[PDB]
Amino acid sequence: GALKYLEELSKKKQSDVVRFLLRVRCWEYRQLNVIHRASRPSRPDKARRLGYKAKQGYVIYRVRVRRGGRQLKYQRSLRATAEERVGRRCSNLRVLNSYWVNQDSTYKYYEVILVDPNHKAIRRDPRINWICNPVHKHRECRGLTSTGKKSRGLNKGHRFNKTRAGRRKTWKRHNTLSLWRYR
Amino acid sequence: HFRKHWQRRVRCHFDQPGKKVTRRLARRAKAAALAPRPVDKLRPIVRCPTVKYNRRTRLGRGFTLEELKAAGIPRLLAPTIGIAVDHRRKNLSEESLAANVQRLKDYKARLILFPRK
Amino acid sequence: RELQKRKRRSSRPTIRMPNRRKKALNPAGNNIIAKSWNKKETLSQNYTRFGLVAKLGKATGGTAPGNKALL
């Protein structure tokens, strides 16, 4: 039941306990490096529902990302930038998925769940051997994480006509002149 | 209407017969794999949504759970004996339910099932 | 282009690739279908000769006069 208790406690963020804990951690993470390793998820329920296991092969990295804009607005989020930086640091791991942890007023903070594809436990266990497959190299760079799908607009409906099934692919398909043999 | 670069985006279908032969050979290869079996799964009969097309029936995606039960075909065995199952479609009409159960009974009568190994 | 030109200029042999296909185009084995399958006949022709249905779907065109395999 601890997972629902944590889910509700995370839903209530400006509550006194969560605000106090977030302040102290925000201080601790500013004292720590821009990108550093975590040990244990500070949000175990979020990590678990995103797919973190306590197996030899799963690791957490906390990354600090500067907030704001370029009046130009960057089409990729600060979440995607954090994932890409964590991947460039740990080039030997696959970025499974990232989640928010702190925000302060100058930097947002994100814990990224990463999986080692070369570990024997990961390779033998299904449900993760897909990320052992080679088509999933640098999902964070190709926009294949949750932030990437959200930014690409990969949803079904009449509100996502131009972006679902690939925006550039749709534009090309609409801008090709098809000529047949019998016209 | 040539303000864009249609020259760099133009497609010619000179491979129409080649693709046709490829498709026919693909249907031959799945028939070689699924030898006694047909190369397609059974599809239900459904009514077209729009009032423009509502007087004509067509082939749907898969058979519904309650019509499958009414015809007497188990859910876990229907995709095995070659019947498509659609858990999203709902009957809402005795007419469609009866027509689809008639279709499944015709399949039952015309089917040959081999006894496992 | 440069790679092909170098190949044509060099004495290293050309690697002729056997016409391998991922999927077999004819039934094989020691069962009734394999022993009664005619490799020179088409799918519909073979299923008409067998007495079996090759497609439970709607016909997408006109069949041969003696076709009985496209229900």
Binding site: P126, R127 | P36, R37, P38, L76, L77, T80, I81, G82, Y107, R110, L111, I112, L113, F114, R116 | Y47, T48, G51, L52, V53, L56, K68, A69, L71
Partner: peptide, 21 residues
């Protein structure tokens, strides 16, 4: 393969069938 998938394939494997003309 996962144990649940193995059980499903064991107890409901793709059967051989023919449909008459």
């Amino acid at each position: 393969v996962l144990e649940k998938t193995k059980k499903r394939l064991t107890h409901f494997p793709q059967r051989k069938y023919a449909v008459k003309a």
